[PDB]
RNA sequence: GGGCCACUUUUGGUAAGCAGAACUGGCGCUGCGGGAUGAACCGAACGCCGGGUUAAGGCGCCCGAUGCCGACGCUCAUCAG
RNA sequence: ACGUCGCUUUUUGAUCCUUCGAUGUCGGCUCUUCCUAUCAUUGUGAAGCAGAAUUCACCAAGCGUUGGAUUGUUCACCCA
RNA sequence: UACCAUCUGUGGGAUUAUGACUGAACGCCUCUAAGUCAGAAUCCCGCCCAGGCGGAACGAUACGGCAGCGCCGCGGAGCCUCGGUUGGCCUCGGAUAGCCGGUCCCCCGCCGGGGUCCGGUGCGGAGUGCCCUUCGUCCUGGGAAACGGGGCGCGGCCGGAGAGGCGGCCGCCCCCUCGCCCGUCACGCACCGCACGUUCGUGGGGAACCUGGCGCUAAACCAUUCGUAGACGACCUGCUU
């Protein structure tokens, strides 16, 4: 019961104009739209859950078709919210405009 | 939040709304822009009409069947302004542009829904009132659009049904102001809890 | 010369004492600058034009900020200045309303750039003093000289245009 | 420089009684009623008195070009008051040299036909703006007499029948023919 | 139209800035954009504030222009604003919007139970005021 | 550089894609503007070209060269047997155009009208409108047509009449009729749709649709010539006789 | 042992993305960030990478960044900028 | 008029940047499109515009701008 | 096949120059500043030509003895494949130098419509909002409910056409006194700190299999013809009464 994670959007990689750095993601989180409003999310854990064809092993259950790339939030990118994230393996480019779950893990409250 | 965003286009500026829409479009967010008849463009009419007439002159003389497609219906004029604000030569920007559905007037998927407003794009907020403004529905009519007269007769009869639904929604709202006057001694405990925590002024 | 909020500096200097005059005369200026570094560098700009005095044959005796004597009463500042255009140079007289002296001179630099495209290296403020209300001449200053000022704020334009960005109700401008 | 306040009151006689639907003046006199929407100029209007009934219009921080529209709205209201207390009578006179001009009045005064203009066979049929009673006088020999309450409709209808009778491809110093506005009067000399 | 004016003694409410949420009095008008502005009883020292930060109220204090602080203070206390304000609806909507932000997770549960019950009694009689109020049998 | 001698362009650009027509009857593409003040009538008809003839008549043009004198005009003859009203169709007007709303074909559709609905009449089993003819003789299939003839009354603005020709009365080899929508102008929508079932299964002659001595418009498909060169198709100037690769070309 | 460009100085020429000198830096031999694009301009020179911060330039959308309740003015252009 | 400020690239020069392991070179014929710096035609303003004729401007390139003698001619010139 | 014969060739709209109207700024004047008018071989559309990797309405939809197909079932058993998503908002028109909400006398078959009055307006009858709100059952008491809830119960009717693919109302039933708040009373895998859990969802799509019930029995192309057509394709036609 309950959603229990806050919802974010994968907007793009860390980039200039004619270069990009795929090791850092840029996330838009709903509700927070200021830089002085985003220190809550400043170290929270985040994830990209996706489904594929083959069954894979699941922690706590029998094998399903959902696979997850895990990451965390490092710091803020700009003035209008917009945290930047760092995942373990770099995000696939098909995930631009898709759901990233900000998970309320390690807490400071 | 994966519902559709529905925007009443009346009273908005053309590119001020287009820049807002074309960034939400890139972030998922299926958005539907209804009532393009009433989108405004800053500057006076004749000046803005000359911009569109100057566009009509751009034409591949070798074969104008292959050249620029000069859409004349307001919905497709607004569809082209956001096209130029999207990377529509890539699959990210073509899957983006499929999320925007543009309509003239308000079709019956969206006539019985609530429309959102963008205050950063409205004519009353972003123009000084001692300026001039053109209507996108009017400069489509003198440019070649066929259907402002059937759209006017279908928006008049929709506003006939909108007054009827409102006067029934407004009639139930003065029933709740009568019910809360009758059964109030039995909600004195419940109306004080909500009054304590920032509700029920 | 840049800007951003101008102070006012009392800069005092004199020529280094050679065996010609053992005590050369002290000179002082009032200088509106962002900080005392610029105030000591604009001092040797004018005192080299007024007197035959350079920085190597001279020293800054006293540099220091001049604070406003009454920053809580509204004063009429008439400013005599001197700038150069794309054509030749011109003299002017402008009037402002401000609480501080250095605030009405900041207000002059933004208004000489707005109306005349005069950059701050072009402008030379030479005199600034507190004009009374009965000696003002400019009509924009004199319209606020009424003991019964009364006006509304007619067309309040919405500033929070993005909080929220998408709302369901159209805003109000009558308050 | 933007002037903080520029007002101009407008006196109102006893036979009229005007109201304000925002920026919409509705003047109602013994000769009918008029109505103009002023929702393109940002001023505030105000009925002040209850015995003499003044009408003030403010401007509140307008520049030089906005400040010009304070006295015009006064002049539009004063043309509504004279329109419904007195009216607008335009006596206008036909000036011919060789060919006399025949003007026959068609249906209820809202249409004129100008036939014998410089001896040409074309018939000029120009429609009146609605509310203008164009007629032919009897104390003069050939002059038109058009009534009405709205000065932007009476003078426009008088300008339709003046732009229609223009001489083309000739000198206009000689060939002084046409129907011209002679005198702008009122009915019921106050 | 136009009833709330800027004048000498107009009590203004500051909407944003360093003094957001303070009532304050207008002392003098500094050239179309700024105003000499002093709140002697709401802890706001005399300074210049733009007219875009402030929002005009209904209350007007009487004192001459550019008067000292002690004369705008005993004019604040005669017809005392701090009991006139915090009795009007706009003052009540401010305190009944910040105490919704001061609402703990257990307070939010108690509103969730009290609202869900209160929307059962109100929902009940609006049926009884539309099925007994439709009892009409007249030509 | 310029040409030095002005000459008009050969051919219109307003008639071109000069392809084979994608049809054979002749699409109307524009019916006469309709206004309710008139009586209720048809606006088009459909006939076959039979051949030409010249006639002799005298002229009444007062002031002309040939007033009260007898001239020889060339005429053509169009065989027009009466068209049979076989159906009805109503259109609703939309901001995207003018879409078709509902059509109601009649019972007792003839075999020459059903011939059109088959590309091969020999091997077919003639089954067209055999499920649809039984809802004219039913109870709970009946009143859905009076729900079809009532929604098309209250929602449509333009109703048309599907009519076909009757080939059995002509000297041609083909027995397949030509169906055609012909709109009904002059009148309100509730009258023109009541009118167009009175005529349903009945014939209308050309005497009703078109009267004496009025001008009409003729819509058809040109006599076909085949693949032709630029001298036949565009009537360009031929090239001089000592041209190497071809006289009947366009040079530049 | 064919050079070329740029600031300033300078010769012939009406002028030239012309021809010829002086001085320094550059391009050629050299990629990178910005100038949309471009041998030379602006910043800065390069082993392979992770974190931080800047330069010149930017920050409605394309397209990273003002979704600041930015400050004060000027400007309406039926070829604006 | 004396002076003086421009535009243009339908003239001719100036330059040598591209092309010498090739980009077919004057004129005509033919054919399409474009430009306006408008000869005519549509709508107008001005005249030392009485009419007729002509002239100077303006929005304007929609539409038209021919048939020949001589010359390879582009140009030129006469006939109609 | 030929100006070498014959026939046909069209209507608006916004406006440019320009001429004006009302009319300020500049207490006079002024085509202009706000607001208007007349206006053309131009421009744009119609007429005309073509008809989108654009829609629509409608027709018929595969058998003579093993053969298919469509609809109505949560009717089943499970496979595969494509992915997304994690509660809803079911709607006045609009004004912005003003609005929203209640209301007395009056009138267009008792809704609407008006001018007084009464409140609200940094919108609180508020999207900065609102509605839902998910631990489970069992014991047991008090309140809200009694003009209640529930079902793919069937029939019955009405409203919705701009892309209606929907939204309400009903007569006979069916069990139910539970579900909403404040409490009593205890139990459930309490899986022994730990991830993809929580939904939409009985998802879309391609198959094949079993078991009921209800209906349906076609065309297109080739070949052959035709010559209103044509390089070839295509196109226009005909083929047991
Ligand atoms: C004296 O000049 C000639 O003989 C011309 C020709 O020989 C033409 C070549 C035709 C062939 C022989 C290839 O059939 C030739 O090689 O022309 C060059 C030639 O050959 C195609 C191309 C040149 C050089 C590059 C482009 N330009 C175009 C034509 C041209 C025209 C000239 C010209 C030179 C070119 C040259 O001199 C004056 O007029
Ligand atoms: Mg799933
Ligand atoms: Mg898994
Ligand atoms: Mg001091
Ligand atoms: Mg928002
Ligand atoms: Mg006047
Ligand atoms: Mg003449
Ligand atoms: Mg040529
Ligand atoms: Mg030519
Ligand atoms: Mg040969
Ligand atoms: Mg060498
Ligand atoms: Mg050398
Ligand atoms: Mg050189
Ligand atoms: Mg060289
Ligand atoms: Mg080197
Ligand atoms: Mg380098
Ligand atoms: Mg670069
Ligand atoms: Mg550039
Ligand atoms: Mg440098
Ligand atoms: Mg780095
Ligand atoms: Mg950029
Ligand atoms: Mg961005
Ligand atoms: Mg060369
Ligand atoms: Mg060569
Ligand atoms: Mg070649
Ligand atoms: Mg070659
Ligand atoms: Mg021109
Ligand atoms: Mg002329
Ligand atoms: Mg042309
Ligand atoms: Mg010869
Ligand atoms: Mg011919
Ligand atoms: Mg017209
Ligand atoms: Mg005038
Ligand atoms: Mg004009
Ligand atoms: Mg007009
Ligand atoms: Mg077209
Ligand atoms: Mg009130």
CA distance B97 to B22: 8
Cα B104 to chain centroid, rounded: 9
Strand I positions within 7 A of protein Cβ atoms: 1, 3, 6-7, 13-16, 19-26, 33-38, 43-51, 54-61, 80-99, 101-102, 110-112, 115, 120-135, 143-149, 160-165, 180-182, 194-198, 217-223, 226, 228-231, 234-240
- Sign of the alpha-carbon dihedral angle for B143, B144, B149, B152: negative
Whether D147 and D47 have beta carbons less than 8 Å apart is answered as no
Touching, A vs B (3+ Cβ pairs under 8 A): yes
Å resolution of this model? 2.9
Residues 147-186 of B with CB under 8 A from E: 172, 175-176, 178-180, 182-183, 186
Q: Report CA(B75)–ligand 13 centroid distance (Å).
A: 59
B chain contacts of residue D65, beta-carbon cutoff 8 Å: 130
Q: Residue C105 — left, alpha, or beta (φ > 0 → left; ψ -120 to 50 → alpha)?
A: alpha
CA distance B165 to C91: 70
Any idea how long chain E is? 139
DSSP element (H, E) containing D28: strand D24-29
DSSP state of D141: S
3-state class percentages of chain D: helix first, strand second, coil last, to nearest 5: 15, 30, 50
Whether F160 and F86 have beta carbons less than 8 Å apart is answered as no
CA distances from C70 to A4, C128, F8 (A): 59, 16, 87
Beta pairing class for F48-58 and F70-79: antiparallel
∠ CA F31-F33-F37, nearest 5°, is 130
Beta pairing class for E34-39 and F179-185: unpaired
Nucleotide at minimal C1' distance from the A52 CA? I83
CA distance B115 to B8: 5
- Give the residue among E94, E136, F157 at the shortest CA–CA distance from B153: F157
Say what angle helices B74-83 and B14-24 make with each other, to 10 degrees: 60
- Sign of the alpha-carbon dihedral angle for F185, F189, F192, F196: positive
C-alpha distance from C175 to closest chain D C-alpha (Å): 14
E55 touches strand I (CB under 7 A): yes
Asked if D65 reaches chain B (Cβ–Cβ under 8 Å), the answer is yes
C-alpha distance from C106 to closest chain B C-alpha (Å): 28
CA distance F48 to F51: 9
CA distance C73 to C56: 42
CA distance B144 to B71: 9
Where do breaks (C to N over 2.5 Å) occur in chain D, by preceding residue number? Answer: none
The full DSSP string for D68-126 is THHHHHHHHHHHHHHHHHT--EEEEEEE-SSSPPPEEE-GGGSEEEE--STT----EEE
DSSP state of C163: T
Q: Report CA(C104)–ligand 12 centroid distance (Å).
A: 66
Whether D76 and D83 have beta carbons less than 8 Å apart is answered as no
Q: How many CA atoms lie within 13 A of D43 on its CB side?
A: 28
Secondary structure string (H, E, C) spanning chain A:
CCCCCEEEEEEEEEECCCCEEEEEEEEEECCCCCHHHCCCCCCCEEEEEEEEEEEEEECCEEEEEEEEEEEEEEEECCCCCCEEEEECCCCCHHHCCCEEEECCCCCCC
C-alpha distance from B100 to closest chain A C-alpha (Å): 14
- Give the residue among C128, C129, C127, C124 at the shortest CA–CA distance from C49: C124
Nucleotide at minimal C1' distance from the F9 CA? H32
The two counts, helices (H) then strands (E), for chain D are: 2, 12
Cβ neighbours for F15, distance < 8 A, ≥ 6 positions apart: none
Identify any residues that bridge with F203 across adjacent strands, giving them in sequence order. Answer: F84
Helix, strand, or coil here: D174?
A: coil
DSSP element (H, E) containing F72: strand F70-79
Neighbouring C-beta atoms of residue B5, cutoff 10 Å: 19
Asked if B150 reaches chain F (Cβ–Cβ under 8 Å), the answer is yes
C-alpha distance from D66 to closest chain B C-alpha (Å): 8
Query: Which residue is listed with tokens 């005369």?
Result: C25
Neighbouring C-beta atoms of residue B45, cutoff 10 Å: 15
Where do breaks (C to N over 2.5 Å) occur in chain B, by preceding residue number? Answer: none
Cα C159 to chain centroid, rounded: 29
Cβ neighbours for F167, distance < 8 A, ≥ 6 positions apart: F112, F174, F175, F176, F177
- Give the residue among B153, B144, B135 at the shortest CA–CA distance from B48: B135
Torsion of CA E121, E126, E127, E131, to 10 degrees: 140
Residues 55-74 on chain D lying near strand I, CB distance under 7 A: 58-62, 64-65, 67-72, 74
Query: Which residue is listed with tokens 């002082």?
Result: C28
Helix, strand, or coil here: C168?
A: coil
A19 touches strand G (CB under 7 A): yes
E chain contacts of residue D2, beta-carbon cutoff 8 Å: 32
Secondary structure string (H, E, C) spanning chain E:
CCCCCECCCEEEEECCCCCCCCEEEEEEEECCCEEEEEECCCCEEEEEEECCCEEEEEEECCCCCCCCHHHHHHHHHCCCHHHHCCCCHHHHHHHHHHHHHCCCHHHHHHHHHHHHHHHHHHHHHHHHHHHCCCCCCCC
Structure tokens given for F32: 């006469």
- Kindly identify the ligand whose nearest atom is closest to the C-alpha of D160: 35
Neighbouring C-beta atoms of residue D6, cutoff 10 Å: 16
DSSP state of F59: B
Q: Report CA(C29)–ligand 4 centroid distance (Å).
A: 15
CA distance A70 to A106: 14
Burial degree of C49 (CB within 10 A; 0-12, 13-18, 19+): exposed
Say what angle helices F189-198 and F145-154 make with each other, to 10 degrees: 140
C163 touches strand G (CB under 7 A): yes
Asked if E2 lies within 8 A of D61 by C-beta distance, the reply is no
Q: What is the largest CA-CA distance in chain D?
A: 61
Residues 46-105 of E with CB under 8 A from C: 46, 48, 51-52, 55-56, 64-66
Burial degree of E14 (CB within 10 A; 0-12, 13-18, 19+): buried
DSSP state of B10: T
The set of chains that have 3 or more CB pairs under 8 A with A is: B
Whether F181 and F34 have beta carbons less than 8 Å apart is answered as no
Whether F164 and F113 have beta carbons less than 8 Å apart is answered as yes
Calculate the angstrom distance between C1' of G9 and CA of C121: 28
Asked if C98 lies within 8 A of E31 by C-beta distance, the reply is yes
Identify any residues that bridge with C41 across adjacent strands, giving them in sequence order. Answer: none
- Give the residue among B34, B52, B30 at the shortest CA–CA distance from B43: B52
Beta pairing class for E54-60 and F70-79: unpaired
CA distance C2 to C33: 9
CA distance F26 to D143: 60
Helix extents (H) in F83-238: 111-114, 145-154, 189-198, 206-209, 230-233
Q: Report CA(F111)–ligand 19 centroid distance (Å).
A: 93
Burial degree of B26 (CB within 10 A; 0-12, 13-18, 19+): buried
* Partner-chain residue, chosen from B189, B190, B197, that has the shortest CB–CB distance to E103: B197
Neighbouring C-beta atoms of residue B186, cutoff 10 Å: 10
Asked if D21 reaches chain E (Cβ–Cβ under 8 Å), the answer is no
- Give the residue among A41, A44, A22 at the shortest CA–CA distance from A30: A41
Q: Report CA(C99)–ligand 4 centroid distance (Å).
A: 13
Burial degree of F47 (CB within 10 A; 0-12, 13-18, 19+): middle
Cβ neighbours for D62, distance < 8 A, ≥ 6 positions apart: D2, D3, D6, D70
- Give the residue among D94, D98, D84 at the shortest CA–CA distance from D28: D84
CA distance F228 to F239: 17
Neighbouring C-beta atoms of residue B63, cutoff 10 Å: 8
CA distance D151 to D87: 9
Structural Rg of chain B based on CA atoms: 22
CA distance B193 to B156: 46
Residues 46-65 of D with CB under 8 A from E: 60-61
DSSP element (H, E) containing B5: strand B5-8
Asked if F96 lies within 8 A of B147 by C-beta distance, the reply is yes
- Give the residue among D17, D91, D103 at the shortest CA–CA distance from D52: D17
∠ CA B59-B63-B65, nearest 5°, is 80
Identify any residues that bridge with F8 across adjacent strands, giving them in sequence order. Answer: none
Beta pairing class for A61-76 and A83-87: antiparallel
Helix, strand, or coil here: C128?
A: strand
Structure tokens given for B107: 């079709």
C-alpha distance from D84 to closest chain E C-alpha (Å): 28
Asked if E103 lies within 8 A of B198 by C-beta distance, the reply is yes
Whether F126 and F114 have beta carbons less than 8 Å apart is answered as yes
Nearest CA in chain D to B132: D40
Calculate the angstrom distance between C1' of G29 and CA of A19: 27
- Give the residue among D61, D54, D53, D57 at the shortest CA–CA distance from D74: D57
**DSSP E strands, chain C:** 9-14, 27-31, 59-62, 75-84, 89-98, 124-131
CA distance D101 to D103: 6
Structure tokens given for D119: 């001896």
- Give the residue among A76, A82, A77 at the shortest CA–CA distance from A9: A82
Whether A5 and B23 have beta carbons less than 8 Å apart is answered as no
Nucleotide at minimal C1' distance from the C164 CA? I128
Q: How many CA atoms lie within 13 A of B98 on its CB side?
A: 6
- Give the residue among B75, B89, B97 at the shortest CA–CA distance from B23: B97
Beta pairing class for B5-8 and B31-34: parallel
Neighbouring C-beta atoms of residue D34, cutoff 10 Å: 22
Nearest CA in chain B to D41: B130
Burial D48-74 (b: 16+ CB within 10 A, else e): eeeeebebebbbbbbeeebeebbeebb
Structure tokens given for F138: 């039913």
CA distances from F106 to A6, B54, F208 (A): 63, 53, 22
């Amino acid at each position: 019961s309950g959603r229990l994670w806050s919802k974010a959007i994968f907007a793009g990689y860390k980039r200039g104009l004619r270069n990009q750095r795929e090791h850092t993601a840029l996330l838009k989180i709903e509700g927070v739209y200021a830089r002085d409003e985003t220190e809550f999310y400043l170290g929270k854990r985040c994830a990209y859950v996706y489904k594929a064809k083959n069954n894979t092993v699941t922690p706590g259950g029998k094998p399903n078709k959902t696979r997850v790339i895990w990451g965390k939030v490092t710091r803020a990118h700009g003035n209008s919210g917009m945290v930047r994230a760092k995942f373990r393996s770099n995000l696939p480019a098909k995930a631009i405009g898709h759901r990233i779950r900000v998970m309320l893990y390690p807490s400071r409250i | 939040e994966v519902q559709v965003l529905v925007l009443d286009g009346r009273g908005h500026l053309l590119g001020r709304l287009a820049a807002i829409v074309a960034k939400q479009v890139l972030l998922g967010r299926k958005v539907v822009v209804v009532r393009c008849e009433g989108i405004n463009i800053s500057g006076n009419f004749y000046r803005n009409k000359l911009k569109y007439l100057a566009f009509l002159r751009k034409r591949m003389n070798t074969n104008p069947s292959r050249g620029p497609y000069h859409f004349r219906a307001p919905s497709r004029i607004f569809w082209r302004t956001v096209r130029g604000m999207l990377p529509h030569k890539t699959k990210r920007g073509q899957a983006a542009l499929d999320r925007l559905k543009v309509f003239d007037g308000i079709p019956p998927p969206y006539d019985k829904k609530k429309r959102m407003v963008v205050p950063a794009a409205l004519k009353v907020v972003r123009l000084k009132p001692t300026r001039k403004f053109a209507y996108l529905g009017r400069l489509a009519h003198e440019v070649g659009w066929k259907y402002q007269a059937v759209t006017a007769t279908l928006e008049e009869k929709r506003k006939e049904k909108a007054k009827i639904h409102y006067r029934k929604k407004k009639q139930l709202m003065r029933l709740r102001k009568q019910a809360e006057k009758n059964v109030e001694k039995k909600i004195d405990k419940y109306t004080e809890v909500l009054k304590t925590h920032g509700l029920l002024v | 010369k840049a800007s951003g909020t101008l102070r006012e500096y009392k800069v005092v200097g004199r020529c280094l004492p050679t065996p010609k005059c053992h005590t050369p005369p002290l000179y002082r200026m009032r200088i509106f600058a962002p900080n005392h570094v610029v105030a000591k560098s604009r001092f040797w700009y004018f005192v080299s034009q007024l007197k035959k005095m350079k920085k190597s044959s001279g020293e800054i005796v006293y540099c220091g900020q001049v604070f406003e004597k009454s920053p809580l009463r509204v004063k009429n500042f008439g400013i005599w200045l001197r700038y150069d255009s794309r054509s030749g140079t011109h003299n002017m007289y402008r009037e402002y309303r401000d609480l501080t002296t250095a605030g009405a001179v900041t207000q002059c630099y933004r208004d000489m750039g707005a109306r005349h495209r005069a950059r701050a290296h072009s402008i030379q403020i030479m005199k600034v003093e507190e004009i009374a209300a009965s000696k003002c001449r400019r009509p924009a200053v004199k319209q606020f000289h009424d003991s019964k000022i009364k006006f509304p704020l007619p067309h309040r334009v919405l500033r929070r245009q993005h909080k929220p960005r998408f709302t369901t109700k159209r805003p109000n401008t009558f308050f | 420089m933007k002037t903080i306040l520029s007002n101009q009151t407008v006196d109102i006689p006893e036979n009229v009684d005007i109201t304000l639907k925002g920026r919409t003046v509705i003047v109602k006199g013994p000769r009918g009623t008029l109505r103009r929407d002023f929702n393109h100029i940002n001023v505030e209007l105000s009925l002040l008195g209850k015995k003499k009934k003044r009408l003030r219009v403010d401007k509140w921080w307008g520049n030089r070009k906005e400040l010009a529209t304070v006295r015009t709205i006064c002049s539009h209201v004063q043309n509504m008051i004279k329109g419904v207390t007195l009216g607008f009578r335009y006596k206008m006179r036909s000036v011919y040299a060789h060919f006399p001009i025949n003007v026959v009045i068609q249906e209820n005064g809202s249409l004129v036909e100008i036939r014998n203009f410089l001896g040409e066979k074309y018939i000029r049929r120009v429609r009146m703006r609605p509310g203008v009673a164009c007629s032919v006088s009897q104390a003069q020999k050939d002059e038109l007499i058009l009534e009405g309450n709205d000065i932007e409709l009476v003078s426009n209808s008088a300008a339709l029948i003046q732009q229609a009778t223009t001489v083309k491809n000739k000198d206009i110093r000689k060939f002084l023919d046409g129907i011209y506005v002679s005198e702008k009067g009122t009915v019921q000399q106050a | 139209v136009f009833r709330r004016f800027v004048e000498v003694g107009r009590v203004a409410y500051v909407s944003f800035g360093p003094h957001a949420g303070k009532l304050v009095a207008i002392v003098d008008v500094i050239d179309q954009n700024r105003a000499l502005v002093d709140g002697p009883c709401t802890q706001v020292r005399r300074q210049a504030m733009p007219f875009k930060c402030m929002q005009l109220t209904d209350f007007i204090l009487k004192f001459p222009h550019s008067a000292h602080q002690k004369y705008v203070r005993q004019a604040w206390q005669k017809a005392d604003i701090n009991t006139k304000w915090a009795a009007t609806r706009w003052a009540k909507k401010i305190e009944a919007r910040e105490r919704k932000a001061k609402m703990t997770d257990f307070d939010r549960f108690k509103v969730m139970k009290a609202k869900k019950m209160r929307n059962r009694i109100i929902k009940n009689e609006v049926k009884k005021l539309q099925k007994a109020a439709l009892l009409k049998a007249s030509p | 550089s310029h040409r030095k001698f002005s000459a008009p362009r050969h051919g219109s650009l307003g008639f071109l894609p000069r392809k084979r027509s994608s049809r054979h009857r002749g699409k109307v593409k524009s019916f006469p503007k309709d206004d309710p003040s008139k009586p209720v009538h048809l606006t088009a008809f459909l006939g076959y070209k039979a051949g030409m003839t010249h006639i002799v008549r005298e002229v009444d043009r007062p002031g002309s060269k040939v007033n009260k004198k007898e001239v020889v005009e060339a005429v053509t003859i169009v065989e027009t047997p009466p068209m049979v009203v076989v159906g009805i169709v109503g259109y609703v007007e939309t901001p995207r155009g003018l879409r078709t709303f509902k059509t109601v074909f009649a019972e007792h559709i003839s075999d020459e009208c059903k011939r059109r609905f088959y590309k091969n009449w020999h091997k077919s089993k003639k089954k067209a409108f055999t499920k649809y003819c039984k809802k004219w003789q039913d109870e709970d299939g009946k009143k859905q047509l009076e729900k079809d003839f009532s929604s098309m009354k209250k929602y449509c603005q333009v109703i048309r009449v599907i009519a076909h020709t009757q080939m059995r009365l002509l000297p041609l080899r083909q027995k397949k009729a030509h169906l055609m929508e012909i709109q009904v102008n002059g009148g309100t929508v509730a009258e023109k749709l009541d009118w167009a079932r009175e005529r349903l299964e009945q014939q209308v002659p050309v005497n009703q649709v078109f009267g004496q001595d009025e001008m009409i418009d003729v819509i058809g498909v040109t006599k076909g010539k085949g693949y032709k060169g630029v001298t036949s198709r565009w009537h360009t100037k031929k090239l001089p006789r000592k041209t190497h690769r071809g006289l009947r070309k366009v040079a530049c």
